[PDB]
């Protein structure tokens, strides 16, 4: 509906452990950031009645290098396309190149299903930095960073309103993920109006071989009915909570969701799960609002 192009430079997005880092990040990082900063501004109760309005949703961090990128379809293609049958060694060595691929181009969303295999474009390299502490037994730690290159940018698709544009205006000067108390999260928001005439297949009604993204999460009333005959991949996303009145900061429960680009068969619903381990004066919200692409 409306994409928000933003580029990163020397950022950090861990996945499992603080020392490790990935080029992208899950969709729950953006939703858990605007709600945390809404209380500091003075409108936490205003955004609570907006996220639960069905039409309001968010997208994952997709690369943008002279064109929007989309994840590869999980399980596609099937066992029918061999792509130039020459030898069993040449066909087997090129099948892994598509497995290590991260995102596909906007113009290759239709040619990949017909029979085409190629190596993903080199977006950025994983670089790490070292730190220590002199007045504490000389201890040290290692953390990784993400330095984009070759004009590597990202974009998130949301809904146009007169309240969301002001909440994200301060996020570019406040950090986003990783070591926020250093400067690993500052970016620049490039606002736009017209997205693209091809990337308008986002629907949530009919079910014609759709594809769920942004880590799907089925509802209790529709789990196995949409899980049978599908392609998915279980991941992992958790960590310690961040509150201001606990004196302990309890651990959030595990929420093994899916991956960006899973192909099911029917249309889900999307709910908001509440993470309450012991007791908290507030409520740890979560995204869990997957979209669908016509493919």
């Amino acid at each position: 509906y409306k994409l928000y192009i933003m580029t990163f430079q020397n950022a950090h997005f861990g996945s499992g452990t603080l020392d490790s880092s990935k080029l992208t990040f899950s969709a729950d990082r953006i939703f858990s950031a605007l709600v945390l900063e809404s209380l500091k501004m003075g409108k936490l109760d205003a955004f609570l009645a907006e996220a639960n309005q069905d039409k309001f949703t968010l997208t994952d961090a997709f690369p943008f290098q002279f064109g929007p990128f989309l994840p590869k379809p999980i399980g596609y293609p099937k066992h029918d396309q061999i792509d130039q049958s020459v030898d069993v060694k040449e066909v087997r060595r090129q099948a892994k190149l598509s497995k290590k691929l991260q995102f596909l181009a906007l113009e290759n969303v239709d040619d990949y299903l017909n029979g085409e295999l190629f190596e993903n474009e080199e977006h950025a390299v994983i670089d790490t930095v070292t730190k220590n502490q002199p007045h504490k037994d000389g201890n040290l730690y290692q953390v990784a960073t993400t330095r984009f290159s070759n004009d590597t940018s990202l974009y998130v698709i949301a809904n146009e309103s007169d309240l969301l544009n002001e909440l994200m205006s301060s996020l570019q000067y406040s950090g986003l993920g990783g070591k926020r108390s250093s400067g690993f999260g500052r970016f620049e928001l490039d606002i736009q109006n017209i997205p693209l005439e091809l990337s308008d297949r986002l629907t949530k009604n009919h079910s014609d071989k759709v594809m769920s993204l942004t880590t799907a999460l089925p509802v209790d009333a529709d789990l196995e009915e949409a899980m049978e005959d599908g392609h998915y991949l279980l991941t992992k996303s958790s960590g310690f909570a961040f509150s201001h009145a606990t004196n302990e900061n309890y651990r959030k429960q595990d929420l093994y969701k899916f991956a960006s680009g899973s192909t099911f068969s029917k249309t889900f619903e999307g709910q908001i799960v509440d993470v309450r381990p012991l007791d908290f004066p507030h409520a740890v919200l979560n995204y869990a609002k997957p979209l669908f692409f016509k493919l």
Binding site: V88, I126, T128, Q142
Partner: protein, 251 residues
């Protein structure tokens, strides 16, 4: 030496052949019997799971996860470098030079998390396959060679030649290698201008030494200048020889 350590991950490259359909050469024999394909895994399991303990003896390292696919050898780099290039030599004679091999040696710091320590050394494995299949990745992702050009050129008559034709010069003599490495990198923007500056460093070392010692330094000047203007891939070989010599004797 230094107080660091290196991690190597020797992994077999090609695996779809010699198991599915690769024994065909004559229409007489079928070359598709299950027994002919089952003896391939048994013949290589004795070298990657049994012969590893015998070949790693009398060394300052310890093999971990000695399987038929990927291994994990950790320890001091004083013996890992002499074990990675040596293990492949025994595999070529066992296979008559029909199966390639690739790996990657990368040093790290002390008291570091093993997560990124074992993940950064694994990224060099995938980066050592952009050319074709018989490549290698040294300490970084820029040293992309063919592995066979190391023990037959770099480790043969390049890295060894410095150990007895430059060891006589110490302290004062070790004030020129740190600059020659920088000249080997700045070659795209500074092409013809860098060639003229190379003729000056070759004369500063010969003039600043003993008169009787000049007899030893008589062929290193011509061999070092020829290795700079001959091939683009040959220019990167001098950066590896000058780096392993500094890590040898120092501190």
């Amino acid at each position: 030496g230094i107080k660091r350590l290196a991690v190597v991950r020797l992994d077999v490259d090609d695996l779809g052949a010699a198991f599915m359909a690769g024994f065909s050469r004559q229409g007489n024999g079928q070359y598709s019997t299950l027994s002919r394909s089952a003896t391939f895994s048994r013949s290589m399991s004795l070298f990657f799971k049994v012969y590893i303990n015998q070949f790693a003896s009398d060394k300052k390292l310890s093999i971990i996860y000695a399987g038929g696919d990927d291994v994990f050898a950790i320890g001091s780099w004083q013996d890992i470098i002499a074990f990675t290039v040596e293990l492949r030599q025994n595999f070529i004679k066992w296979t008559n030079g029909k199966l390639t091999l690739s790996a990657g040696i990368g040093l790290f710091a002390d008291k570091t998390p093993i997560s990124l320590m074992a993940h950064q050394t694994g990224e060099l494995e995938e980066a050592a396959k952009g050319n074709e299949k018989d490549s290698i990745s040294l300490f970084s992702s820029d040293y992309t060679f063919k592995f066979d050009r190391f023990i037959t050129n770099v480790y043969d008559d390049k890295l060894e030649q410095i150990r007895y034709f430059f060891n006589h010069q110490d302290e004062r003599g070790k004030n020129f290698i740190y600059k020659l490495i920088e000249l080997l990198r700045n070659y795209e923007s500074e092409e013809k201008m860098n060639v003229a500056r190379l003729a000056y460093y070759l004369t500063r070392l010969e003039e600043l030494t003993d008169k009787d010692e000049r007899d030893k330094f008589k062929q290193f000047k011509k061999l070092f200048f020829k290795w700079y203007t001959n091939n683009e891939s040959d220019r990167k070989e001098a950066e590896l020889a000058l780096l392993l010599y500094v890590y040898e004797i120092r501190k």
